[PDB]
């Protein structure tokens, strides 16, 4: 059954994405002398992993790799209600296993926060929600525009375009809220490390941005 | 009406470009603890954002996202005079709102200059005009060459080719003049911050570079 193969693809795609991306953000300098946080390091690993994962699993499950976009397809009637509940559950499970494996292989002296997204100390959580609302908006709009069958002028790798959309989101909002733009990516390490601070902005934020982006494209720009 | 949708797309696309790209230029160490400036951070965020915006809005409004290229199409009779004035006004408006949002979500101690393009202290504005004239010339020439219908050897993503043209412009002239190569990108934060020093070189510069690039391609190289 392709339905079970699609769900297992989403679980496995998220598992690789979380494990590889959260590993790159590990600060090997430790707490006694933290090394400067390489910034293009985190952006490319998060960005290119999505491009790699969409290339790998795009034809098997659609390559949502995000609870935010999965909701957008339901809002735009691209997948069924029963379709999304298995995707969201599989995506959340993949992050939990993906981050759980990383905790086992990472030496305790360099684990730190395990890539858990934190809002800046001087930044209000209200502004943190707005940042997530926008960085996910450009991501979902790119995904919808790149995967439009009615278009003709689409050139190049669709997965690469989606990957670079994630990278610029990280190139902007790592110090604001961690540039989550993925509720599953924030749910995983939060479960493992037991850190649950301002976690609602990482679900309400991307979902509102996803629904706004999907509705604008499907019902206003290209109806 | 497709006219209203095209102008709205330009306002929205240009707004996202400012907020994401100017945010990457924020020095989170502040004036009192300046962190070293990451050049690939600024270059890639600016370069890939244009490549993302062209992918998102290329089929809706043409994906100018620049007052300089809009003049170039007029100089080559590719868009109407009435079309350009609404494009330029929307692009100027998008940067003003886009920079205003960034000023709202940035902590006061790290706002700094808000990405406003100053000329280097040891560099004369006369030489600064020449730098802006050239890095915009290579941008407009790439856009005209990438989007030429008569060509048959164009391969890969057109948006990515335009995106990397912007990136190399930033990799060259960030400490020369800030590598504006976009009159709207300089007008937006300047309005918000009220900094108006050598601002004419950021309008006269890119526009003259665009006119030379558009005229040379359309009337000399590939007539």
């Amino acid at each position: 059954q392709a339905f079970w193969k699609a769900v297992t693809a989403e679980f496995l795609a998220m598992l690789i994405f979380v494990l590889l991306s959260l590993g790159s953000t590990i600060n090997w300098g430790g707490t006694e002398k933290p090394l400067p946080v390489d910034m293009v390091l985190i952006s490319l690993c998060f960005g290119l992993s999505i491009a790699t994962m969409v290339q790998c699993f795009g034809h098997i499950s659609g390559g949502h790799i995000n609870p935010a976009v999965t909701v957008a397809m339901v809002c735009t009637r691209k997948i069924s209600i029963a379709k999304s509940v298995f995707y969201i559950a599989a995506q959340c499970l993949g992050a939990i296993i993906g981050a759980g494996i990383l905790y086992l292989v990472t030496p305790p002296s360099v684990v730190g926060g395990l890539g858990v997204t934190m809002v800046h100390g001087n930044l209000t959580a209200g502004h943190g929600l707005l940042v997530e609302l926008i960085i996910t908006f450009q991501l979902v709009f790119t995904i919808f525009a790149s995967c439009d069958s009615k278009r003709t002028d689409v050139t190049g790798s669709i997965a690469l375009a989606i990957g670079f959309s994630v990278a610029i989101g990280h190139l902007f909002a790592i110090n604001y809220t961690g540039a989550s733009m993925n509720p599953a990516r924030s749910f995983g390490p939060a479960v493992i490390m037991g850190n649950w601070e301002n976690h609602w902005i990482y679900w309400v934020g991307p979902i509102i941005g996803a629904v706004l982006a999907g509705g604008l494209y499907e019902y206003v720009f290209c109806p | 009406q497709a006219f209203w949708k095209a102008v709205t797309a330009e306002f929205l696309a240009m707004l996202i470009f400012v907020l994401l790209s100017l945010g990457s230029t924020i020095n989170w160490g502040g004036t009192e603890k300046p962190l070293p400036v990451d050049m690939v951070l600024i270059s890639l965020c600016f370069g890939l954002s244009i490549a993302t915006m062209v992918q998102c809005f290329g089929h809706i409004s043409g994906g100018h996202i620049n007052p300089a290229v809009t003049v170039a199409m007029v100089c080559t009779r590719k868009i109407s005079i009435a079309k350009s004035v609404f494009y330029i006004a929307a692009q100027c408006l998008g940067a003003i709102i886009g920079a205003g949002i960034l000023y709202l979500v940035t902590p006061p101690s790290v706002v700094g200059g808000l990405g406003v393009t100053m000329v280097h202290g040891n560099l004369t504005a006369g030489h600064g005009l020449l730098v802006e004239l050239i890095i915009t010339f290579q941008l407009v020439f790439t856009i005209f060459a990438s989007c030429d219908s008569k060509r048959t050897d164009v391969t890969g993503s057109i948006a990515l080719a335009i995106g990397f043209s912007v990136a190399i412009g930033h990799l060259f002239a960030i400490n020369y003049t800030g590598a504006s190569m976009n009159p709207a990108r300089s007008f937006g934060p300047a309005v918000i911050m009220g900094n108006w020093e050598n601002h004419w070189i950021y309008w006269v510069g890119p526009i003259i570079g665009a006119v030379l690039a558009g005229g040379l391609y359309e009337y000399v190289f590939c007539p």
Partner: antibody
Amino acid sequence: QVQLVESGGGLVQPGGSLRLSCAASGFTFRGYAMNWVRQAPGKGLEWVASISGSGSITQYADSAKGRFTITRDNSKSTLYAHVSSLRADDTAVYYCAKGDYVFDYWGQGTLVTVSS
Amino acid sequence: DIQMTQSPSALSASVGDTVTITCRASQSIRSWLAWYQQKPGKAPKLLIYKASDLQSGVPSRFSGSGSGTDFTLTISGLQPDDFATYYCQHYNSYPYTFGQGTKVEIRR
């Protein structure tokens, strides 16, 4: 136009508890980190505690750990410092100062005397 | 922690003289240093941040230098207002620590 006003000082029995306030106005209180600095009579300055703009991150000096708790309320733009288990050494003049790294704006100072 | 020691403890000078005080850090803190001026019964006033930058509103006669562990604050032309107590502050890493304080006194 930026000023900080302190309150809550004065005499206090040893081993008690105290609440120090620092009312702030003229600047965006939410977006700036707040600090507590004391100066014992005849001695130098001693940094005590730090709090982020949203209160998410708080740090304390080695001698200020446990006994002192710093919290801020951005609704009324007031900074509080819970001083518990006061000792005879803990007497000093306390200043509230803003600044993540370097303090530029200081209050007038509140004198706390711990004496039976 | 990082212990910051000042030298001399107290120095004497006349109006118009040039004096320098030194702040010594236990470990390297590069250009993360701050200087303050405090008069009796008054809050400290910030003079220098980044160990070489002058805070706005401060006269240019104050000059700071040094990096790593050796820092020197120098006053070019002494003034009657300049007689106060000067502290060196560390902000490379938490906890932030001040110096032991150096007092400037009139010479007679």
